[PDB]
Amino acid sequence: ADGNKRLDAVNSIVSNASCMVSDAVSGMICENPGLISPGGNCYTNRRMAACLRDGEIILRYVSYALLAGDASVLEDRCLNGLKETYIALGVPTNSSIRAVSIMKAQAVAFITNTATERKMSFAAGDCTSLASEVASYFDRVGAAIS
Amino acid sequence: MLDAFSRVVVNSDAKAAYVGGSDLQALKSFIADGNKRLDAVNSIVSNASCMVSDAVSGMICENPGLISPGGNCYTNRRMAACLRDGEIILRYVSYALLAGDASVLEDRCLNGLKETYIALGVPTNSSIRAVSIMKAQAVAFITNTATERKMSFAAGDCTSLASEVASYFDRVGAAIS
Amino acid sequence: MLDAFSRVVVNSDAKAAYVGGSDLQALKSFIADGNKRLDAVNSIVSNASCMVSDAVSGMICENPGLISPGGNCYTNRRMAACLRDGEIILRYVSYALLAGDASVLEDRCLNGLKETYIALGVPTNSSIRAVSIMKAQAVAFITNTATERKMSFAAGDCTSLASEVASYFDRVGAAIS
Amino acid sequence: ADGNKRLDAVNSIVSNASCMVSDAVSGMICENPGLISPGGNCYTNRRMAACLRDGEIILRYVSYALLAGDASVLEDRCLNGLKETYIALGVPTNSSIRAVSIMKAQAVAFITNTATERKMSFAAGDCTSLASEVASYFDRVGAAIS
Amino acid sequence: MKSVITTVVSAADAAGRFPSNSDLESIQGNIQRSAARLEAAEKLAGNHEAVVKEAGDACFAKYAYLKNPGEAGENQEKINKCYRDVDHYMRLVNYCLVVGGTGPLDEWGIAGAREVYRTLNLPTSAYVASIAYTRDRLCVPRDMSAQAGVEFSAYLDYLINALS
Amino acid sequence: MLDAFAKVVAQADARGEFLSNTQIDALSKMVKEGNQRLDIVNKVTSNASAIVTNSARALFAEQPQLIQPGGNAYTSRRMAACLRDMEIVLRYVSYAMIAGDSSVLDDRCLNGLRETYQALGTPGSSVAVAIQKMKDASVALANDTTGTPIGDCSSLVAELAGYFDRAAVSVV
Amino acid sequence: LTLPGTAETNLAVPSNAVRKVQPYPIAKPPSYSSVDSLRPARVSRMDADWATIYEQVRRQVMGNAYVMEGEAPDIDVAFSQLKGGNLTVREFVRAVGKSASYRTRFMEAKSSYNFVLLNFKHFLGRAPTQEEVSTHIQILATSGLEAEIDSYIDSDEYKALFGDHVVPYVVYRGTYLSSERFNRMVKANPGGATSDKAKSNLNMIATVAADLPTDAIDVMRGLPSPITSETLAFGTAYYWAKVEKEASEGRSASPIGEKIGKFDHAPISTYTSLCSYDKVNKAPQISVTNVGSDEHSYVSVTSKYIAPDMAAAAQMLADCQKYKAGGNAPTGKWMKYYPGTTVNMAPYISLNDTGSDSSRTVSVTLDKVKISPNK
Numbered sequence A, D: 001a002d003g004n005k006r007l008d009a010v011n012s013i014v015s016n017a018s019c020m021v022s023d024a025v026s027g028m029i030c031e032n033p034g035l036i037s038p039g040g041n042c043y044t045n046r047r048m049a050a051c052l053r054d055g056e057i058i059l060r061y062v063s064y065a066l067l068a069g070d071a072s073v074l075e076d077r078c079l080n081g082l083k084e085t086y087i088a089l090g091v092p093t094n095s096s097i098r099a100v101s102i103m104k105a106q107a108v109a110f111i112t113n114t115a116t117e118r119k120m121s122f123a124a125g126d127c128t129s130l131a132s133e134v135a136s137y138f139d140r141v142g143a144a145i146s
Numbered sequence B, C: 001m002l003d004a005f006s007r008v009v010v011n012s013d014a015k016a017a018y019v020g021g022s023d024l025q026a027l028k029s030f031i032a033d034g035n036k037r038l039d040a041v042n043s044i045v046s047n048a049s050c051m052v053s054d055a056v057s058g059m060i061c062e063n064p065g066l067i068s069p070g071g072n073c074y075t076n077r078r079m080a081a082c083l084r085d086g087e088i089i090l091r092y093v094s095y096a097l098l099a100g101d102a103s104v105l106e107d108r109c110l111n112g113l114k115e116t117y118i119a120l121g122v123p124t125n126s127s128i129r130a131v132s133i134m135k136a137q138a139v140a141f142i143t144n145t146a147t148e149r150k151m152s153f154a155a156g157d158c159t160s161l162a163s164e165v166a167s168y169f170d171r172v173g174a175a176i177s
Numbered sequence E: 001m002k003s004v005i006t007t008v009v010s011a012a013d014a015a016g017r018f019p020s021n022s023d024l025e026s027i028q029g030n031i032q033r034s035a036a037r038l039e040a041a042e043k044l045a046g047n048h049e050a051v052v053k054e055a056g057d058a059c060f061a062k063y064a065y066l067k068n069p070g071e072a073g074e075n076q077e078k079i080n081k082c083y084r085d086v087d088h089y090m091r092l093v094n095y096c097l098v099v100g101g102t103g104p105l106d107e108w109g110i111a112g113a114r115e116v117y118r119t120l121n122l123p124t125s126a127y128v129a130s131i132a133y134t135r136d137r138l139c140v141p142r143d144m145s146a147q148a149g150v151e152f153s154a155y156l157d158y159l160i161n162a163l164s
Numbered sequence F: 001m002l003d004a005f006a007k008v009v010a011q012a013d014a015r016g017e018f019l020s021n022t023q024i025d026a027l028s029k030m031v032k033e034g035n036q037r038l039d040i041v042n043k044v045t046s047n048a049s050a051i052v053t054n055s056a057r058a059l060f061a062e063q064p065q066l067i068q069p070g071g072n073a074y075t076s077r078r079m080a081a082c083l084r085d086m087e088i089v090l091r092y093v094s095y096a097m098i099a100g101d102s103s104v105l106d107d108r109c110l111n112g113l114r115e116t117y118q119a120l121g122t123p124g125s126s127v128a129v130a131i132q133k134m135k136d137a138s139v140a141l142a143n144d145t146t147g148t149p150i151g152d153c154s155s156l157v158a159e160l161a162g163y164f165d166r167a168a169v170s171v172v
Numbered sequence G: 001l002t003l004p005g006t007a008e009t010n011l012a013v014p015s016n017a018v019r020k021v022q023p024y025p026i027a028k029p030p031s032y033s034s035v036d037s038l039r040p041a042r043v044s045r046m047d048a049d050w051a052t053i054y055e056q057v058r059r060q061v062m063g064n065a066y067v068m069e070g071e072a073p074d075i076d077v078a079f080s081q082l083k084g085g086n087l088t089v090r091e092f093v094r095a096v097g098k099s100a101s102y103r104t105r106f107m108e109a110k111s112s113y114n115f116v117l118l119n120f121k122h123f124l125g126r127a128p129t130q131e132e133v134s135t136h137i138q139i140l141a142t143s144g145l146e147a148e149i150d151s152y153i154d155s156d157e158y159k160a161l162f163g164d165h166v167v168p169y170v171v172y173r174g175t176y177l178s179s180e181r182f183n184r185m186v187k188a189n190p191g192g193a194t195s196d197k198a199k200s201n202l203n204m205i206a207t208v209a210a211d212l213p214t215d216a217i218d219v220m221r222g223l224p225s226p227i228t229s230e231t232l233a234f235g236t237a238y239y240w241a242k243v244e245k246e247a248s249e250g251r252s253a254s255p256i257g258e259k260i261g262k263f264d265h266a267p268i269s270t271y272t273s274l275c276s277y278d279k280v281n282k283a284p285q286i287s288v289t290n291v292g293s294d295e296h297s298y299v300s301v302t303s304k305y306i307a308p309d310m311a312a313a314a315q316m317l318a319d320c321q322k323y324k325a326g327g328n329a330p331t332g333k334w335m336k337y338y339p340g341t342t343v344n345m346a347p348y349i350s351l352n353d354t355g356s357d358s359s360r361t362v363s364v365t366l367d368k369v370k371i372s373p374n375k
């Protein structure tokens, strides 16, 4: 029944949720520049826009899971059959895991207030119970696309 | 447009009911904290230039893709455009806070704002961040807990008005989403 | 709007690159045949009235359904309309030939021309023929190959400009197609 | 079948795995400043970034070996032919051993909770069986690049 | 944009008439002045980050007060922003040297400049100091030819007049 | 009709020449890209219905004078004639794609087609529009990497676009 | 009030105090304009009675503002001097714009944007371009309504087109500057029963004029063309393309998925396993609001559809070009030790200690490794 720490933890995500998707897809390209290549899957704005939308979807789907405090809604209208529509659309299954892990590493940095670019203003304490719970939620969504 | 006193008569007019002493005490309470709303609007509009210049630069310094060529805030003219595109938003939220309900910014500022930014190519999630920073600055100001400049007030509570200006700022978020 | 010199700066501005001596020789070549383009534009606009009256009558005398009642070029007012509807086209192709690129007729004349002729009931394939006759007359004139009237010129090549005015005339074909 | 002590031991590595690579490559430069020299192998960010990535690889490859409790995965898709690709890339074989031994000396300090900069919070006991096992794993990877 | 050709076509279009004889009479003026301005353009281009280095610092020499805390230059990244800000003006002047008019200067650096620098507290005096220091350091014999420096200085003092 | 091998065979016969070794080099590199040639015609064939239908739909969205009353596609039979005319060109372009040259396209599809449309009163420029709308629809589909090994087949894509261009200028 | 015969107030140019009032009204524009023979004639001050000159002002600069006798005394105070000959009809329609009864339904009731379109339609008879709105919102928001309504009357277009003695009306000018400003003008001015009061927003030209591309629909700009310029096209063919339009012109149907921001979505058959098409791409929108109250803090949740943004995607493609031209990796015969994509790959471990026992969790996943440029 962790009230205030949960509400402080979701606030550190949904406010700076606009950096996190654009940083993650640039990091997704940063390893693999053959994705923006002619013939790649991150070609022109038909596909790049759907990538930003899809990176945003799985980001938010986790903040409501954290607000509710459980992974039920992450499997109800989120995930039951997300792998086969991705292999039907022909997305690369490798770099999507990398994009998911950039979100993990950024969310665990935002929750523990260890960001080098922005120091957040919190009450004094330690959010170690919630920094691992979002890691468990992100692995739940990383175990699906595999 | 519609103020808080005129909001209840269009509700009572729908049932042909006289406004009577059963709903007048919610109005008399609204009159009783008239000075609290009044000083709060003043505290908003006092420091409004740094309110805009700080928020747009904070929106820039987290997403430095707009400064790159091809960015929407790239050139000098478009930055002059964006610095006023949010100053109008603050200017209408100051109207809605004074009037007591969100009717003056909904059909004047917010009606047609979505397809304007869609047709021009303005990134909506960046404008979401830019107005969220303005919301945070607003609740910092009208609760007098801005660590950056303090204003003198009579002692008491002001959170009832602080949630009001928060509920005005997500309407600008929803209409652009 | 945009000329040929201003076409390369909006390309170099997209990469924040200085225009340097690696792409300047294509501009200096464009300056070197300045007199060829200049006499060609003059040879177009010298005999421009027969250019229009011949083309519209040639479009008529192959498809004599427009002269029949119910035709789009039937009455006297609509023929006066059609005689200027192509004179404007020639007037803007003369701008695009002088400016060096097809930007001045693209948003000024061609933007919105399709639904205008659709909403008015103008047969598009007839206007295709009318502008193809004008294209043929243009390449006849600026190559000095008109068997009908000859103009004096300094000797040399002009086909590089003759393909240019051909590429302007299919843009008027594509925009109402 | 050491359950809780193993899981406490990997947690003391993968959390503070970000210091350990950057401390080790700065320590690698610390005696040998001719590596950042013009003509050295730790010249500009083409090569320094591959160094940070490579120091990170052999760090993690040991934490999964410790989680599994054996050195099998440290020799299957880790090590069978890592020496000759390094002599084909022309890296210095001397200072790589030094970089590996800085990781050893830091991992054995993190496991025994003898860090001067950060005191970890553990259950009461003594992790002497695991402080030597990671030394054996790091020895296994140090015997390869020799 | 605002070039020599795009006035004579827009005037003939607003009048609704063909390109007349005076209209092609004005494009001949390009043939005599392009040889002077294009060589100014890539002597600017091949030397360009030199004249941000030795001229973007002159405003800090003239105005050392703005390196104080609470000023326009607080940390090093704002000074990098300042050098980027003046390199943009040096790029736009090169764009106007090649176009033949002050087209690329108007809507890319000048239109809207009064709003931003007032709202973001940037003094225009430190801009025109760095531009004017680049203006008076011109010498026909060296830097460039006799006619290159003329309109190279004319495109500079246009920006000086527009910022003030 | 001739394919690409029979074409230089006819070249070499009509001057009585033995085939030089360099021409055998030229034919073996056509043999080398056989699977990549077959991969394209296969992708065009399995999408042939959606190519014609989407290109035809986008044609009347921007040329609405054809399907309005009086137009040359205002019937159910003139409309079905138009769709089947588009399938004909998509068929013969794919024939020329595996042949290697445009003999069968020029010979029994495009020969006399301009005169046919002139006799019927069909606007040939609007046929040329629909052909280039099928062209970019098939080209963007032939650059799809699903179901194929990762490699280069760009010169074959340019060869495929050339046949659509040849059919486009042949009917105006 | 001011002069028994006046020419031009406020002396914007210096050369208007010498300028006398025009003795006779300005003639037609000298282009030929084939539509004009169908349209009814102009209404000047000399030819009209005072009944029809008032009716035609109420039909053009007011739309059909639908005015009663008790409403708008201020229009009639300005009319009380027009009928006396004090001021011209140019200054009269300036005085109508400054009045409150014009404000309370056009500046007031509308938005920031289509008030400018409603001004162009009411005074110049046409629709503006985007760069014309761009230099006009600066007049409107930072200099006020007064200078904004002044900027039409002192404009050369108004002076050249209507002069000092002719009511505003929609003018067909033959040659137009753009081809788009012909049919934007026709779209902005329909015939009878116009009703600018009806639509609170019109939402259609407010996004077609909002960009120089995306010209509006064929049928909206061929609807109010006069009869026999467009009849024998409106029995059954475009008629159902018209009523299906005017249904959407009621309630101001928004063009978000139509004509602007068009996006060809993937086939429904490709995601039948995931969800139905009525719920695909909806996501919970969470707003968490802090205030030091407990009585007055709030949380809001709502599922919303998230459209792909082509503007932000275009910016991201231009940014990631720097990684495209910097190489990938060196290779050699030693690649056999890294058989798959396992070059520079490593297992990621995450360990989830928490207060509850059941919610503890261990990770392992294999993935690529790259160091960020800030380290």
Ligand SMILES: *CC[C@H]1/C(=C/c2[nH]c(/C=C3N=C(/C=C4\NC(=O)C(CC)=C4C)C(C)=C\3CCC(=O)O)c(CCC(=O)O)c2C)NC(=O)[C@@H]1C
Binding pocket: F066, F072, F073, F077, F078, F079, F081, F082, F083, F085, F086, F088, F108, F109, F110, F113, F116, F120, F122, F123, F126, F127, F130
């Ligand atoms: C996109 C539709 C376009 C269009 C088509 C159209 N075509 C016809 C009529 C004919 N088309 C042909 C062409 C061929 N016949 C063949 O056998 C082959 C194989 C090599 C080709 C390429 C012929 C011979 C005819 C006439 C025979 C017939 O009547 O079908 C018609 C008219 C049909 C009719 O009038 O009954 C249409 C409408 N027309 C368009 O407007 C579109 C641009």
Ligand SMILES: C=CC1=C(C)[C@@H](Cc2[nH]c(/C=C3N=C(/C=C4\NC(=O)[C@H](C)[C@H]4CC)C(C)=C\3CCC(=O)O)c(CCC(=O)O)c2C)NC1=O
Binding pocket: A003, A004, A005, A007, A008, A009, A011, A111, A112, A113, A121, A122, A123, A124, A125, A126, A127, A130, G288, G289, G290, G291, G297, G298
């Ligand atoms: C929606 C409304 C709403 C919120 C946003 C939060 C805000 C909030 N958090 C706490 C209070 C707290 N908040 C935190 C949370 C943190 N401390 C940290 O160092 C980390 C940055 C972060 C964890 C990620 C902690 C540790 C406390 C003190 C213990 C507690 O009260 O839970 C309090 C009590 C008073 C105070 O301490 O300020 C409030 C109002 N609670 C709410 O009701």
Ligand SMILES: C=CC1=C(C)[C@@H](Cc2[nH]c(/C=C3N=C(/C=C4\NC(=O)[C@H](C)[C@H]4CC)C(C)=C\3CCC(=O)O)c(CCC(=O)O)c2C)NC1=O
Binding pocket: A016, A018, A019, A020, A023, A024, A026, A027, A028, A029, A030, A031, A102, A105, A106, A109, A110, A114, A115, A116, A117, A118, B062, B063, G370, G371, G372, G373, G374
């Ligand atoms: C070229 C290739 C390329 C990449 C590999 C990534 C680089 C990158 N940065 C971060 C890491 C991060 N990214 C953010 C996100 C942000 N920081 C803020 O303050 C903003 C609010 C927000 C948008 C910028 C944060 C807070 C961290 C953790 C702190 C840090 O490492 O900088 C991470 C995750 C942790 C890590 O492994 O380092 C990665 C992979 N971006 C790239 O472009």
Ligand SMILES: C=CC1=C(C)[C@@H](Cc2[nH]c(/C=C3N=C(/C=C4\NC(=O)[C@H](C)[C@H]4CC)C(C)=C\3CCC(=O)O)c(CCC(=O)O)c2C)NC1=O
Binding pocket: A025, A028, A041, A042, A046, A047, A048, A050, A051, A052, A054, A055, A057, A058, A077, A078, A079, A089, A091, A092, A095, A096, A099, G264, G265, G266, G271, G274, G279, G280, G281, G282
């Ligand atoms: C409820 C949960 C939920 C989601 C997770 C998304 C899932 C999702 N993604 C796509 C569809 C897609 N998603 C992507 C995104 C990507 N492809 C890649 O290679 C990268 C991994 C990533 C960009 C970085 C692309 C490229 C498409 C297909 C666009 C196309 O080519 O048709 C579609 C098909 C519908 C459409 O996009 O029109 C759906 C349902 N939507 C949801 O409703």
Ligand SMILES: C=CC1=C(C)[C@@H](Cc2[nH]c(/C=C3N=C(/C=C4\NC(=O)[C@H](C)[C@H]4CC)C(C)=C\3CCC(=O)O)c(CCC(=O)O)c2C)NC1=O
Binding pocket: B056, B066, B072, B073, B078, B079, B081, B082, B083, B085, B086, B088, B089, B108, B109, B113, B116, B120, B122, B123, B126, B127, B130, G111, G112, G113, G133, G134, G135, G137, G141
């Ligand atoms: C009555 C209410 C009212 C408003 C809210 C504004 C809304 C508005 N903004 C712009 C126009 C604009 N608005 C922006 C603003 C932004 N783009 C960004 O990248 C940022 C997210 C954001 C600034 C924070 C920009 C950059 C333009 C100009 C677009 C361009 O030409 O590049 C325009 C077009 C007119 C013009 O361009 O001059 C309008 C109507 N105006 C109004 O009259």
Ligand SMILES: C=CC1=C(C)[C@@H](Cc2[nH]c(/C=C3N=C(/C=C4\NC(=O)[C@H](C)[C@H]4CC)C(C)=C\3CCC(=O)O)c(CCC(=O)O)c2C)NC1=O
Binding pocket: C056, C066, C072, C073, C078, C079, C081, C082, C083, C085, C086, C088, C089, C108, C109, C113, C116, C120, C122, C123, C126, C127, C130, G033, G034, G035, G036, G172, G174, G175, G176, G177, G178, G179, G182, G229
């Ligand atoms: C700036 C660019 C610009 C143009 C290109 C023209 C385009 C144009 N043409 C017409 C209007 C017209 N254009 C034509 C022309 C033709 N119909 C035919 O059958 C032939 C194919 C063709 C002549 C060769 C006719 C006949 C009309 C009048 C239609 C009618 O009322 O019957 C109109 C409507 C205005 C009016 O009718 O007065 C416009 C805007 N005007 C411009 O301002």
Ligand SMILES: C=CC1=C(C)[C@@H](Cc2[nH]c(/C=C3N=C(/C=C4\NC(=O)[C@H](C)[C@H]4CC)C(C)=C\3CCC(=O)O)c(CCC(=O)O)c2C)NC1=O
Binding pocket: D003, D004, D005, D007, D008, D009, D011, D111, D112, D113, D121, D122, D123, D124, D125, D126, D127, D130, G351, G352, G353, G360, G361, G362
């Ligand atoms: C992933 C979940 C997970 C963990 C992180 C660990 C955490 C953990 N460790 C121990 C319990 C223990 N943990 C240690 C470990 C250590 N003691 C030290 O002084 C050293 C710092 C460190 C060795 C490196 C010891 C010695 C015990 C007691 C004996 C034992 O239970 O193993 C216990 C039992 C209760 C307790 O004592 O707290 C738990 C939950 N176990 C788990 O299931």
Ligand SMILES: C=CC1=C(C)[C@@H](Cc2[nH]c(/C=C3N=C(/C=C4\NC(=O)[C@H](C)[C@H]4CC)C(C)=C\3CCC(=O)O)c(CCC(=O)O)c2C)NC1=O
Binding pocket: D016, D018, D019, D020, D023, D024, D026, D027, D028, D029, D030, D031, D102, D105, D106, D109, D110, D114, D115, D116, D117, D118
């Ligand atoms: C200039 C040359 C130069 C070096 C030679 C090295 C210095 C260095 N420091 C450590 C030693 C260490 N390094 C760490 C690592 C860390 N400590 C923390 O608390 C952080 C979480 C993390 C990143 C800083 C730890 C815990 C020790 C052991 C304790 C200590 O000796 O300080 C070691 C290994 C043990 C030893 O032999 O001393 C070395 C070689 N760094 C240099 O720059």
Ligand SMILES: C=CC1=C(C)[C@@H](Cc2[nH]c(/C=C3N=C(/C=C4\NC(=O)[C@H](C)[C@H]4CC)C(C)=C\3CCC(=O)O)c(CCC(=O)O)c2C)NC1=O
Binding pocket: D025, D028, D041, D042, D046, D047, D048, D050, D051, D052, D054, D055, D057, D058, D077, D078, D079, D089, D091, D092, D095, D096, D099, G328, G329, G330, G338, G342, G343, G344, G345
């Ligand atoms: C599965 C196990 C596994 C690894 C261990 C690494 C091993 C590894 N390292 C490098 C490649 C490299 N690794 C280094 C790193 C260093 N050179 C030095 O002198 C220092 C010892 C160290 C920095 C401190 C450098 C400099 C290169 C080559 C970069 C180059 O110059 O091309 C490559 C070539 C591919 C590439 O980098 O593009 C591989 C496979 N990758 C793996 O997949």
Ligand SMILES: C=CC1=C(C)[C@@H](Cc2[nH]c(/C=C3N=C(/C=C4\NC(=O)[C@H](C)[C@H]4CC)C(C)=C\3CCC(=O)O)c(CCC(=O)O)c2C)NC1=O
Binding pocket: B057, B060, B067, B074, B075, B076, B077, B079, B080, E056, E059, E066, E072, E073, E078, E079, E081, E082, E083, E084, E085, E086, E088, E089, E108, E109, E116, E120, E122, E123, E126, E127, E130
């Ligand atoms: C296409 C043309 C073009 C330009 C001319 C510049 C103009 C310009 N400069 C700045 C922005 C700036 N410009 C400066 C420059 C200066 N401040 C000083 O102390 C000195 C007076 C001067 C340098 C000599 C600084 C310091 C900032 C950052 C201010 C801030 O972020 O608060 C911004 C806001 C966006 C940003 O932060 O980058 C814009 C539009 N940008 C352009 O795109």
Ligand SMILES: C=CC1=C(C)[C@@H](Cc2[nH]c(/C=C3N=C(/C=C4\NC(=O)[C@H](C)[C@H]4CC)C(C)=C\3CCC(=O)O)c(CCC(=O)O)c2C)NC1=O
Binding pocket: E043, E044, E047, E050, E051, E054, E136, E137, E138, E139, E140, E142, E143
């Ligand atoms: C395209 C524009 C452009 C410039 C303005 C200069 C800018 C400039 N001038 C000088 C350097 C100089 N500039 C001059 C000035 C002059 N020299 C003479 O012979 C004349 C009398 C007088 C013309 C004004 C002198 C005397 C020096 C050398 C001493 C010094 O550094 O001041 C330097 C230092 C090194 C160098 O010479 O390059 C630089 C960057 N360079 C450029 O590329």
Ligand SMILES: C=CC1=C(C)[C@@H](Cc2[nH]c(/C=C3N=C(/C=C4\NC(=O)[C@H](C)[C@H]4CC)C(C)=C\3CCC(=O)O)c(CCC(=O)O)c2C)NC1=O
Binding pocket: F034, F035, F036, F038, F039, F040, F042, F142, F143, F144, F145, F146, F148, F149, F150, F151, F152, F153, F154, F156
């Ligand atoms: C049953 C009918 C039948 C077919 C359809 C083909 C299909 C086919 N193509 C390839 C093999 C191939 N196919 C392609 C073609 C492409 N790859 C791409 O990435 C592009 C999207 C596309 C270019 C048009 C390429 C390029 C190769 C060789 C792999 C390479 O070197 O890139 C192979 C493996 C044999 C080989 O290596 O050549 C097969 C069986 N063969 C058949 O018997």
Ligand SMILES: C=CC1=C(C)[C@@H](Cc2[nH]c(/C=C3N=C(/C=C4\NC(=O)[C@H](C)[C@H]4CC)C(C)=C\3CCC(=O)O)c(CCC(=O)O)c2C)NC1=O
Binding pocket: G064, G065, G066, G067, G192, G193, G194, G195, G196, G197, G198
């Ligand atoms: C040239 C032809 C022409 C017309 C036919 C009318 C059509 C017309 N009616 C109204 C406007 C109206 N028309 C009605 C009429 C009715 N509503 C009902 O419930 C009844 C069924 C019906 C009366 C019998 C009402 C009530 C309004 C005002 C709506 C309102 O504001 O409440 C308006 C909007 C202008 C305004 O509101 O002032 C217009 C254009 N005007 C014209 O210029």
Ligand SMILES: C=CC1=C(C)[C@@H](Cc2[nH]c(/C=C3N=C(/C=C4\NC(=O)[C@H](C)[C@H]4CC)C(C)=C\3CCC(=O)O)c(CCC(=O)O)c2C)NC1=O
Binding pocket: G001, G077, G078, G079, G080, G081, G082, G083, G084, G086
């Ligand atoms: C802002 C201030 C303001 C005013 C004061 C009035 C002033 C005024 N009065 C009249 C116009 C008039 N005023 C009168 C009034 C009178 N004649 C008499 O015999 C009585 C002495 C007196 C009434 C008590 C009459 C009778 C006319 C009309 C003259 C006529 O046409 O016969 C007119 C001409 C306009 C018109 O005729 O419609 C004006 C401007 N109007 C204004 O806008």
